[PDB]
Design a protein around this ligand. Structure first.
Ligand SMILES: [Mn+2]
Ligand SMILES: [Zn+2]
Ligand SMILES: [Zn+2]
Length: 1937
């Protein structure tokens, strides 16, 4: 006993805190027996865990382990026959119970499983304990570790290790031991060999119905014969009879069909859009009434703002009296204004804000003054002390900040109010609920009323979204067929002119669709404009886009300027169509425009499907779609109709029609109704399965199927694989034939298709599912209410104020913070919050202690008001109640009486429904084996150890159904649990590895996508057959059984092992997926249960209670959830399309190439030897695809004029720009958290928009729009703000920093300060790069801030105090100076510089836009800006002094001076510092060409062309990772330790100086962290994403020419002088002694600046080759560098070949026995075609032009596949060069061996049984050569390009090049002398400092002999010669003579 005895002593360090601890310790220590030891230890550890865990929550440990019934029976509580459950911790108080069940699971999977299994068993008890008992709150304590608060967190793991060692030492079944060790480890993919895989007598029939026809060994020729016979049968049995699927166009018939389907003729609607649509009539009325025709108001608006602000404090705990105090204040101030200045109630009110007998009040409410004074008459006589209390309550316990000096305490004099009421007579609105046409004939109006129409529509949309902002917790004073006399309705205002305004009246609040009424007011006379009914959250697009739409339609119309007379008819039609589209948002319009797009696509080409016209019609309702459909059809006809002269310019027509059809992106996609969309999604999901007949009913969810379930499953599996190859009846039903599958498999296995199994890189390396879309699941509500009631019970150690509600606001997302956290909720969110509040309050009330609901759901919180009248509810709640209500409001709210307080607070208010609910809930109207007793404490019983063919002993792969929003129609969505998510992840990783091993598929490979793009473009330009095939129902039709059979039939051969990998685990996971369970949404279930003909509703009602229970779980055969098996489906489609293209190539002798995307494909067919003889081919292809599970949609098109792939249309010559799509994308998706991120998003969108040649005048309008949006929110304009205005075509070669710099430069007219700052930045750049002495000191100088850093940089460059006081005067207001703007926006429920966040995002791995922007504008009005505290934005902007000193007026509200911000100086930063930072950042980013000055320069709007960026980077262009990390670690150590690198295991490479001290990353990174709006480090680690820009020529000629000359003024070195001085130094250094011509004598010279001077277009004299080699960092030494005589060209081509040597040696046994060849030929004549190994040694004698020679031999090893009879089959090739040859020689050799008449081509192969006769020794022939030819891939082994002899060679390191007298000496022979000039001064400058005297002697004696080979007399014979005379060497100058 080693560890048995040590365990007793090691556990002695335990504290017996409770009695149970000691009581179990005395028994454990006094019992030494192996059989109970493990059990006792595990149970004592579990008791530790559970006791600590629950005692942390005010516990009472369950020591009896008794049931709930007995613990309820202890006190006096009746037994409702509750289900048996054993609780871990219980706490009973009054009539409330808290149950806590704790556990421990170290892995997230089993933890989530246990939590979701415990929450349900705790929740299913409340339904029985609440009906005739008490309430409860369930709590679940889940711990992912064995840690606690009793031990030092170091003994638990020791005890665990000792226990597992004792267990593995001795035991005492098979799986109970594997889970115990697994459930005590710490952390621990495929290869699940630990499983058992036991059979259950059911997988037998599965394998018998799945793998009977699968053989995968069919020959090649028999398939050819079968396809020939099938084609011959198809030609004369189904095609000659007229049962095809495609047909020719006959464009006239298509025009007639569109005119019949689109242009309605049997309709009663008129041909005028204004009198059909109500909104169009309204806007027409307003625009034709507007076009054809003072301290009082500001004081009123200020006091309106004050009262609206004070209303938000809710300091009165009541809504009625608050509004009464407010309108009292309002009427008192109104009568105080009307005391004098008689020209105020009529002049500054009628033209201001007042209407007939109505005044504006708080919360945008309009109230009648008669009703106002009448309600003021109340509260008097019965409560005369009201005004006094309300006046004395605003002084104490109040903010006490108010200007209500006299307008508050004044008693309202009623006589003056009556006089005012009699002044203006009642003219109240009518609120029209539920034939002559005079609408000016829009087609013939002026060019001014349409722009006014657009302006009015924009104003109306703004008014609508402003009505959307109305608060939710608002109730009118008095409540309310076809006409309602409005008196207390909500109203919004909008200004249109100088006097007339427009009023918008409505009665409801929230985000629902409402009915509105629009009125006008010219000079006080309130007229009537109309009424309508719409949804406010569907008009966000035109809020300010009144100029963008005008510009885009003007440009789209001018596109057709080729015929003067055609655009005049299409312009107004287009504008009216756009207008009608904006005024009527609907999905039907989007579907109609998509159908029109498909119609145009089919019209452009030559062949189209026969079922096309049935996919274009849509049922129109509300008579609003008729007009838009008629307009679209008329436009299409006007553009397409014509006999002969109808296609003068067809490209323009096609582009115009495409952009018109793409107008569907203007209408948003925000699910007009959620319940209907969910129902329709369920319909579309479950309809095909009911039609097929395999949808089973609720399974056991454990892996146990009944006999009928497995019977119907096998029946469906058989029906799936029961399709023949001849019957034409099954061409639209799912299923596949096994014969064609076996054919394709056997054809793919034997390397016949374009793909093979030669893959590399072996791939074997808490929400609820029943509710998706709900903001809060039941589990989260229950957890929140339990936590809150637990906190409130812990606090009571009574009385509780409303602060408990604050707790609800703290855990879901002090009156100010309460209001700030409460404003950020939506209508459904506030309803859920009220529900949670009600639950918490009733729970606390029960802790403190009509008959139609018992038979129905006994829940009182869900009783609907739609079953009872309102008069009964209003009269019953106001009855006699003595002990149910209490006197007073009782703000303190002690415990025990909260129920009465709630009833009284609800009764004093206006609403009585909550009063009735509280009244009802008050009236009490709701009344020793180790396998069974050891899996309840902490045993992970649900761990996977043994699985079956349908489950995994841990579930059945449950899923959840939902929808996803799209333009045309909603898409499906499946979300899974964690286990099935991991399984799908493994499957998709395996399949994506297999696909990445493939080539032709393009889904996660942009290279193949670009290849397909260029192939399609070339085919369209040449005129090949392009066929775009879209497939219908790809998701809901595929089945996992097809993939199972496919993977069973494949082999997946390894690259180098050829091992036939066993796909056992993959097939197991696929069998698991085949039996997945899809759970239906609960909303559809309730909608079909509560309760038009619907098939899925019929199935629901048929399966409701007939066969079983209500359907909640649906399993079937063919599901293939969309977005689950995407990669497997992609690979299957790829192989099927390869088989199909092979079949087509073999049958119709054409050349097909196919590209796939797992949903649609594109086939480019090159035909031999107009296109009317290919219908049989395409219909045969369609038939063959329908034989598989690849049904083609009628939207697929075949032609030769236009191609489509991934919504990218290519036509002859160019590409369609798709303007309107990008325009609508820019106008939409306004997601704003801060103005900076919105500016950046709009920047990216406008960049990618202008990339596709849109315009330069429209982007300016979008920038102005976003500027106005950020200004309207109350932020005010900032110098940076949104995208600059008045831009140019220089979005190319320009980033966000460049356009910010352009904006800042445009701020100043005559740039002298910014030019000086640019000069200082250029000086810093030169001194840091050329002078190159600056590092990490600028880091110390910049970290301070902006002011001192700028003057420090200036004094480093150079300045005086004048510059300090001059440049630093320009200031701008930065509101986010002491941090960021605090705000809580409309986020989902349940919840430091930015560079750190971007880096964290890089290392690591349903909401509307209108509501988001509304919440943004609302949250930008509270206390947001921070200091020291928080305050307002207008409070800061009100402190600026209007000095106006001729320097702060060049741009108001943008640039100020210093003394103008003396009141507020904390938010004041210089803009010139930001300009300096931006200039330096652009310099470190994209070159120094931005330091010069901007100069201005001195085309039919249709000349488009492509341009490329002209950027030049000096920042180490590669710039990968592990460089910014090192710079941060060096510069910011504390910032690198904290907030960075906890989630990193590769710190060693980032620490060992991986290319440390980058050129500029050191200083170009510190400006990014301090400035909050640069963002360059997050930009440098990103690609251009465009790489090309299509632009018009008209914008290229009007751009600014900003190209900088060299800052050194061309004065530095004149690189020609660099070259000549370097050559002079080299020649004079060589002419003192012989040196080798290696890199040792070229890099070792100072003037070798040739590696510098990035522009290397010109070399020195002759050394081009060695310079280009050094640019690649060559290690060469010397060779014959005589490129003057071309060694790469004019080379002998004496090429030949040799025999081969087969690997996998089997020939040595059959080589010698021939002594024959006959038996060998007979052996070569089961089939034994194995792999073939070819070995070749090709030796050539490549010569050169100069005197030289070279012998070069190449070894070629080819791994191919032996053929049956025809030629051969190839897999891979490899080459290895060798021999003696120069770089040019080997380059020529390797280029010609890859471009020779050899294997690539005719192969020039001479077999003749010759090389076989040499390998297989024999001297006989059998009169049969059977010549073969290779079809090699075309690999490119051209990666040496050096002097290297390619890793092998018998000759190395000879022929050294030396230099003695300026002449190349190869071995002693003179080649030539290159000319070098010195001009006299240079030679003496070199002679100055030398080694000794004899060196100078040698140099000057060898100089003139080299002068004989040169020509230089320019050496000045003057005083310089007298200086050279210092070296008295007359003999040297007199020896040459
Ligand atoms: Mn497509
Ligand atoms: Zn009309
Ligand atoms: Zn000023």
């Amino acid at each position: 006993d080693e560890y048995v005895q040590e365990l007793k002593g090691l556990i002695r360090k335990h504290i017996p805190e409770r009695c149970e601890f000691g009581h179990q310790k005395v028994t454990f220590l006094s019992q030494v027996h192996p059989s109970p030891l493990l059990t006792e230890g595990f149970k004592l550890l579990s008791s530790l865990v559970e006791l600590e865990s629950c005692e942390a929550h005010a516990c009472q440990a369950n020591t009896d382990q008794r049931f709930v019934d007995v613990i309820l029976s202890d006190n006096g509580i009746l037994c409702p026959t509750l289900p048996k459950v054993i609780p871990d911790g219980f706490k009973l108080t009054g009539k409330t119970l808290i149950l806590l069940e704790t556990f421990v699971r170290v892995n997230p999977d089993e933890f989530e499983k246990k939590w979701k299994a415990d929450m349900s068993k705790l929740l299913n008890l409340k339904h029985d304990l609440q009906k005739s008992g008490v309430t409860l709150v369930p709590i679940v304590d889940g711990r992912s570790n064995y840690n606690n608060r009793f031990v030092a967190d170091w003994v638990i793991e020791r005890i665990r290790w000792l226990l597992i060692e004792i267990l593995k030492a001795s035991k005492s079944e098979d799986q109970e031991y594997q889970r115990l060790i697994h459930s005590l480890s710490n952390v621990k993919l495929e290869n699940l060999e630990h499983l058992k895989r036991n059979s259950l007598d059911y997988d037998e029939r599965l394998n018998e119905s799945l793998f009977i026809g699968l053989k995968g060994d069919i020959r090649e020729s028999t398939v050819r014969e079968e396809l020939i016979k099938l084609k011959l049968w198809f030609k004369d049995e189904v095609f000659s009879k007229g049962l095809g699927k495609f047909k020719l166009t006959d464009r006239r018939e298509l025009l007639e069909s569109l005119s019949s389907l689109g242009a309605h003729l049997d309709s009663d609607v008129s041909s005028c859009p204004f009198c059909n649509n109500k909104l169009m009539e309204i806007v027409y009325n307003v625009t034709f009434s507007c076009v054809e025709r003072s301290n009082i108001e500001k004081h009123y608006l200020s006091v309106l703002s004050l009262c609206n602000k004070i209303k938000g404090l809710k300091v009165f705990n009541t809504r009625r009296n608050t509004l009464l105090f407010l309108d009292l204040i309002m009427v008192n101030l109104m009568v105080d204004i009307s005391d004098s200045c008689q020209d105020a109630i009529e002049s500054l009110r009628k033209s201001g804000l007042i209407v007939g007998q109505m005044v504006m009040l708080v919360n945008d409410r309009v109230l009648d003054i008669l009703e106002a004074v009448k309600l003021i008459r109340k509260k008097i006589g019965t409560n005369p002390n009201w005004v006094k209390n309300c006046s004395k309550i605003l002084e104490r316990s109040h903010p006490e900040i108010w200007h209500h000096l006299s307008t508050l305490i004044k008693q309202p004099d009623f006589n003056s109010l009556i006089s005012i009421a009699q002044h203006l007579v009642s003219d109240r609105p009518i609120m029209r609920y539920s034939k002559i046409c005079r609408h000016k004939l829009f087609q013939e109006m002026s060019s001014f009323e349409q722009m006014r129409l657009f302006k009015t529509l924009s104003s109306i949309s703004l008014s609508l979204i402003n009505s959307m902002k109305t608060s939710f917790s608002s109730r009118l004073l008095v409540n309310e067929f076809g006409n309602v006399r409005l008196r207390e309705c909500y109203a919004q205002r909008f200004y249109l002119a100088e006097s007339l305004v427009g009023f918008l009246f409505y009665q409801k609040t929230g985000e629902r669709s409402r009915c509105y009424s629009v009125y006008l007011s010219d000079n006080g006379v309130m007229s009537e404009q109309g009424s309508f009914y719409c949804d406010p959250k569907r008009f966000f697009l035109p809020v300010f886009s009144d100029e963008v739409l005008a510009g885009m339609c003007e440009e789209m119309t001018s596109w057709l300027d080729f015929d003067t007379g055609l655009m005049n008819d299409t312009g107004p039609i287009l504008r009216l169509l756009v207008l009608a589209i904006l005024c009527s948002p609907s999905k039907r319009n989007q579907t109609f425009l998509q159908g029109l797009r498909y119609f145009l696509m089919a019209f452009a080409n030559q062949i189209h499907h026969i079922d096309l016209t049935s996919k274009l019609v849509v049922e129109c309702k509300s008579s609003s779609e008729v007009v838009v459909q008629r307009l679209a059809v008329g436009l299409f006809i006007r553009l397409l109709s014509g006999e002969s002269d109808a296609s003068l310019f067809f490209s323009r027509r096609f582009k115009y029609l495409l952009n018109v059809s793409y107008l569907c992106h203007l209408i948003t996609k925000e699910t007009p109704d959620r319940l209907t969309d969910q129902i329709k999604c369920f319909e579309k999901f479950i309809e095909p399965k009911v039609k097929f007949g395999c949808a089973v009913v609720n399974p056991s969810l454990n892996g146990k199927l009944t006999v009928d379930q497995e019977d119907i499953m096998i029946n469906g599996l058989k029906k799936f694989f029961s399709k023949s190859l001849r019957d034409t009846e099954d061409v639209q039903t799912p299923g596949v034939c096994k014969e064609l599958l076996n054919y394709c498999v056997s054809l793919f296995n034997r390397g016949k298709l374009k793909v093979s199994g030669e893959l590399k890189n072996n791939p074997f390396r808490i929400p609820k599912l029943d509710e998706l879309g709900n903001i809060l699941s039941t589990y989260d509500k229950e957890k929140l209410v339990s936590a809150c009631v637990s906190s409130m019970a812990e606090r009571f150690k009574n009385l509780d104020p409303d602060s408990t509600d604050y707790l609800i606001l703290k855990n879901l997302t002090t009156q100010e913070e309460l209001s700030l956290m409460y404003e950020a909720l939506t209508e459904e969110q506030v309803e859920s919050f009220n529900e949670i509040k009600h639950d918490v309050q009733v729970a606390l009330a029960k802790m403190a202690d009509v008959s139609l609901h018992e038979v129905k759901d006994f829940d009182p919180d869900v009783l609907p008001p739609e079953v009872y009248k309102e008069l009964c509810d209003a009269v019953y709640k106001s009855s006699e109640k003595c002990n149910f209500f209490l006197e007073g409001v009782l703000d303190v709210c002690p415990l025990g009486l909260l129920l009465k307080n709630l009833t009284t607070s609800s009764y004093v208010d206006e609403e009585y429904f909550m009063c009735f609910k509280y009244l009802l809930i008050q009236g009490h109207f709701d009344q020793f084996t180790n396998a069974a007793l050891r899996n309840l404490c902490f045993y992970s019983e649900d761990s996977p150890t043994e699985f079956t063919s349908i489950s995994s002993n841990s579930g059945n792969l449950k899923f959840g159904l939902s929808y996803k929003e799209q333009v045309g129609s909603n898409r499906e969505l499946y979300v899974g649990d964690l286990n099935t998510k991991l399984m799908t992840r493994l499957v998709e990783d395996f399949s994506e590895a297999v696909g990445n091993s493939m080539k032709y598929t393009c889904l996660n490979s942009e290279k193949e996508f670009e290849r397909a793009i260029c192939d399609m473009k070339m085919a369209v330009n040449n005129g090949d057959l392009s066929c775009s095939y879209d497939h219908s129902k790809w998701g809901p039709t595929m089945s996992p059984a097809l993939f199972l059979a496919l993977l069973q039939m494949l082999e997946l051969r390894t690259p180098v092992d050829r091992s036939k990998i066993d796909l056992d685990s993959v097939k197991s996971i696929l069998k698991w997926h085949l039996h997945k369970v899809v759970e239906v949404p609960i909303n559809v279930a309730e909608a079909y249960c509560i309760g038009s003909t619907s098939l899925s509703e019929e199935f629901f009602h048929q399966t409701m209670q007939l066969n079983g229970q209500i359907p909640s779980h649906i399993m079937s055969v063919l599901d293939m959830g969309q977005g689950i098996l995407h990669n497997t489906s992609d690979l299957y489609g790829l192989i099927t399309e390869q088989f199909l293209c092979y079949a087509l190539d073999l049958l119709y002798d054409v050349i097909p190439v196919s590209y796939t995307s797992s949903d649609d494909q594109i086939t480019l067919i090159k035909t031999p030897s107009d296109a009317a003889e290919w219908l049989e081919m395409i219909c045969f292809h369609e038939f063959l695809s329908s034989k598989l599970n690849k049904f083609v949609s009628p939207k697929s098109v075949i032609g030769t004029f236009v191609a489509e792939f991934k919504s990218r249309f290519f036509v002859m010559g160019e590409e369609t720009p798709l303007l309107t799509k990008f325009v609508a994308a820019a106008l939409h998706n306004v997601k704003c958290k801060t103005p900076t991120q919105l500016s950046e998003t709009i920047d990216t969108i406008c960049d990618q928009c202008i990339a596709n040649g849109v315009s330069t005048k429209i982007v300016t309008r979008i920038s102005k729009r976003v500027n106005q949006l950020i200004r309207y929110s109350g932020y005010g304009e900032t110098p940076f703000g949104a995208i600059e205005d008045q831009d140019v075509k220089d979005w190319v070669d320009g980033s966000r920093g460049y356009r910010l710099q352009r904006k800042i430069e445009a701020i100043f007219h005559d740039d002298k300060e910014t030019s000086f700052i640019r000069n200082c930045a250029r000086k810093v750049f030169n001194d840091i790069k050329r002078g190159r002495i600056f590092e990490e000191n600028l880091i110390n100088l910049i970290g301070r801030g902006g002011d001192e850093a700028l003057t420090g940089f200036l004094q480093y460059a150079g300045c005086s105090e004048q510059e300090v006081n001059r440049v630093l005067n320009y200031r701008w207001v930065n509101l986010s100076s002491f941090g960021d703007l605090r705000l809580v926006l409309r986020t989902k429920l349940m919840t430091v510089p930015t560079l750190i966040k971007t880096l964290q995002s890089k290392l690591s791995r349903q909401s509307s836009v209108a509501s988001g922007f509304i919440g943004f504008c609302k949250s930008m009005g509270s206390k947001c800006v921070r200091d020291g505290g928080f305050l307002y934005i207008k409070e800061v902007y009100s402190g600026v002094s209007a000095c106006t000193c001729e320097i702060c007026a060049l741009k108001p509200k943008i640039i100020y001076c210093n003394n103008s911000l003396n009141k507020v100086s904390q938010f004041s930063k210089p803009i010139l510092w930001d300009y300096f930072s931006l200039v330096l950042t652009n310099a470190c980013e994209l070159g120094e060409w931005v330091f010069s000055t901007v100069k201005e320069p001195q085309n039919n709007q249709n000349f488009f062309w492509a341009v490329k960026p002209k950027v030049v980077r000096q920042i180490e262009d590669q710039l990968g990772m592990n460089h910014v990390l090192q710079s941060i670690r060096r510069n910011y150590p504390v910032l690198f330790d904290e907030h960075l690198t906890p989630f990193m295991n590769d710190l060693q490479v980032s620490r060992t100086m991986d290319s440390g001290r980058l050129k500029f990353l050191d200083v170009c990174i510190a400006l990014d962290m301090m400035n909050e709006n640069l963002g360059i480090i997050s930009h440098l680690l990103k690609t251009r994403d465009n790489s090309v820009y299509i632009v018009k020529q008209s914008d290229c000629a009007l751009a600014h020419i900003r190209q900088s000359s060299y800052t050194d003024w061309e004065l530095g070195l004149s690189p020609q002088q660099i070259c000549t001085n370097f050559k002079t130094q080299l020649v004079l250094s060589s002419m003192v002694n012989p040196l080798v011509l290696s890199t040792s004598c070229l890099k070792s010279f100072f003037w070798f600046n040739e590696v510098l001077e990035l522009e290397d277009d010109s070399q020195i004299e002759l050394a081009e080759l060695t310079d280009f080699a050094l640019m690649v960092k060559n290690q060469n030494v010397s060779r014959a560098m005589f490129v003057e005589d071309i060694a790469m060209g004019y080379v002998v081509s004496n090429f030949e070949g040799v025999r081969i040597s087969l690997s996998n040696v089997m020939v040595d046994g059959v080589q010698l026995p021939p002594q024959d060849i006959g038996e060998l030929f007979g052996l070569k004549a089961g089939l034994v075609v194995q792999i073939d190994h070819v070995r070749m040694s090709t030796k050539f004698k490549l010569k050169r032009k100069m005197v030289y020679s070279f012998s070069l031999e190449c070894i070629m090893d080819v791994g191919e596949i032996q053929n049956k009879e025809v030629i051969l089959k190839v897999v891979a090739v490899d080459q290895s060069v060798s021999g003696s040859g120069g770089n040019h020689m080997l380059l020529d050799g390797v280029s010609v061996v890859a471009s020779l008449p050899l294997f690539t081509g005719q192969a020039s192969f001479d077999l003749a049984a010759m090389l076989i006769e040499s390998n297989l020794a024999g001297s006989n022939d059998n009169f049969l050569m059977r010549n073969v030819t290779l079809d090699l891939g075309g690999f490119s082994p051209e990666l040496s390009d050096k002097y290297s002899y390619r890793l092998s060679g018998p000759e190395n390191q000879e022929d050294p090049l030396v230099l003695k007298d300026g002449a190349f000496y190869v071995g002693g022979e003179r080649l030539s002398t290159y000319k070098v000039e010195f001009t006299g001064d240079l030679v003496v400058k070199a002679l100055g400092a030398l080694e000794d005297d004899e060196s100078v002697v040698s140099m000057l004696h060898q100089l003139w002999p080299y002068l004989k080979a040169t020509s230089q007399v320019i050496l000045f014979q003057q005083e310089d010669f007298t200086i050279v005379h210092d070296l008295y060497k007359k003999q040297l100058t007199k020896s040459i003579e």
